[PDB]
Amino acid sequence: SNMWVIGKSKAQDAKAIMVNGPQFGWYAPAYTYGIGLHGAGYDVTGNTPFAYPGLVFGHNGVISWGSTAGFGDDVDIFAERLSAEKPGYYLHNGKWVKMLSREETITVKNGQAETFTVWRTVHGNILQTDQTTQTAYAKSRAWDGKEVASLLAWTHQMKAKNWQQWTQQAAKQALTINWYYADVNGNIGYVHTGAYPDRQSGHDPRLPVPGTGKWDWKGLLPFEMNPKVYNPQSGYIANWNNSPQKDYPASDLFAFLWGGADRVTEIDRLLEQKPRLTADQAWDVIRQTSRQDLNLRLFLPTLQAATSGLTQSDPRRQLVETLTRWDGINLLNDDGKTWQQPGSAILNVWLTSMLKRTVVAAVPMPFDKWYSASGYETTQDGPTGSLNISVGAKILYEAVQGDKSPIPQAVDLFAGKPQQEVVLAALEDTWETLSKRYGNNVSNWKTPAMALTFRANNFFGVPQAAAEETRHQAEYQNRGTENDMIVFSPTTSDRPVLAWDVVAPGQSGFIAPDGTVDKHYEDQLKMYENFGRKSLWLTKQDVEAHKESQEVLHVQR
Amino acid sequence: SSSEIKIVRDEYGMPHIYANDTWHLFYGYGYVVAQDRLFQMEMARRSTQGTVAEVLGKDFVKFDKDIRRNYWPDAIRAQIAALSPEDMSILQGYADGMNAWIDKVNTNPETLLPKQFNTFGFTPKRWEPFDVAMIFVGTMANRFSDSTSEIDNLALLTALKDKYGVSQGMAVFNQLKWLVNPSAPTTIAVQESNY
Lengths: 557, 195
Ligand SMILES: O=C(O)Cc1ccc(O)cc1
Ligand SMILES: [Ca+2]
Fold this sequence. Notes:
The structure holds two protein chains of two kinds. Chain A is α+β, with helices and mostly antiparallel strands. Chain A is 22% helix and 23% strand.
């Protein structure tokens, strides 16, 4: 998910501009739900995933808010000591404590029911047990017992009118999430929210700890430790799920890293390129970053250095010259199925070869498979989420940086060979593979574009629509599932705020029993594809002026 | 009027709710959610509680067990039981609003029942505050805030220890899965603060 907030000093023809692109995957019907709430302290407009009570994206006329997932480490695993004799017990602080337990029956349509038991300890639910070692793993979340309060914080923040009021609610949001602020006076802010454990000295948060008592967390760190910044010297806040701050540790996921190679740099280069940005230019960054190859920037200098002493008729050099002329923006041909330049296909094959020779080679099976992906892997329906830089490519980037990388190279990933020899062998592999399928004339290579599917199954893999309700878009775009833009104090209007969004396929997913589809079932789908947007209304006058219908209810509690 | 809820939809069908107190406000919200996205919401509810195999069968029994293994329902009910009356109103309002539209749908299914209920053979059920809270827990806290690979990390570490020996295995582990890397591009500039 990406976000760019532009404040007073960087904005052109407004005091503040917020553009959010939450990336949750693409679904039919739409992942978020549009809703305006006017009464009982509330005066809000925006859209929110699964119609939560609190609007994750929107504004109240004074301030605006947005989110990106967080990825701090707020979950650790406690290895609990069981006993062969006295089962259902576990050792904690010198006594054998009994487990909480519950029985569950799964009713099955056209099958027998199934019952099983769920176990829990002071640390959390038991994930798995090792009977051989008499160990059980408990997953322990820092937000445990604060789920409901996190939902309420997201609701109550819609009423804040300033920084102070807003951070009071951000302090109560316990999940690891980045929250962003903007207001009518042009102030902008950021908080990496959530509850983080206050761990005992010597606790490596990447691996399990014994659950017998000595490693228990001491409590939670205060909200003053949460990374946060208000009205930054730079004039802007940008995030693509990238590290909040210097020295902040990331999730313990093996596939997740905050390294020198990061896709947020792509947003930074565009915001640093212009002294000020208009609303229309802030919206335009969606289109550039959607189409940008993320590996070009990283490995072009290495490819250039290695093929510098090569002759012009050397195919490995021809591949690098193609890359050197490319700006890295993918564009569809007229056929609607192939890209105009073969760049991504070349980097994809190269990178796959480079990892097989370097990172993959140093890691024992079967963990070598964790580091092979190039990051271009999709299927015919296209990627299920955002495109990113793969773990293996982030590890390889540190290795090609030499002693300019801060990460000690315990193993030489090039295994004694000069870098350029490994780079050139991979480039030979790339030429062999691609020329075999497209031939030797690089200029007529028509490589396959990625496409985009609005899926009928939700993110769990469960149907939320019939399979024919699936929608297909020819151009894959690395962009938010929805895009929303709030512009405060526009010099070009008399309105204090102006906001836009796009919620595809449509606001409604209703289909009558005779198969008649709602009028608002898919009236936002072409708008999505062409980077368009619709206005969000807040004031009464604007809502009346664009009203298409009205319904009044009289109800007493 | 304290009993009135006015629902205005715009040109794109986006509902705006006008109401005077908490419970009427969120009752309106739930009511238009039930009008626009009932089948989606119903599948989400089953997804987040692990009750998919009841309407969809044997292919979803593992899924349902995995969902129930990952939370503790009594803990969620206890948090709901401690809300103040104002906070409780948000959740109850919303479930009541849904229930109002689900009542008319189950009363006039020939015109009001979403096609996919007939297709998949089952009908909507009434909601309580616990169901509203489990939508958010299930799809926000468990999708984006529950990530850990600590057990797999230890299996990698052990394997690097066997291949490169004890100290060397650890130093390779920090090469592949570093704790922090000081060159990472950050949202906060170093001039403002550091962890
Ligand atoms: O960034 C993500 O992975 C999705 C996400 C976006 C916004 C948010 O608040 C939580 C999760
Ligand atoms: Ca951890």
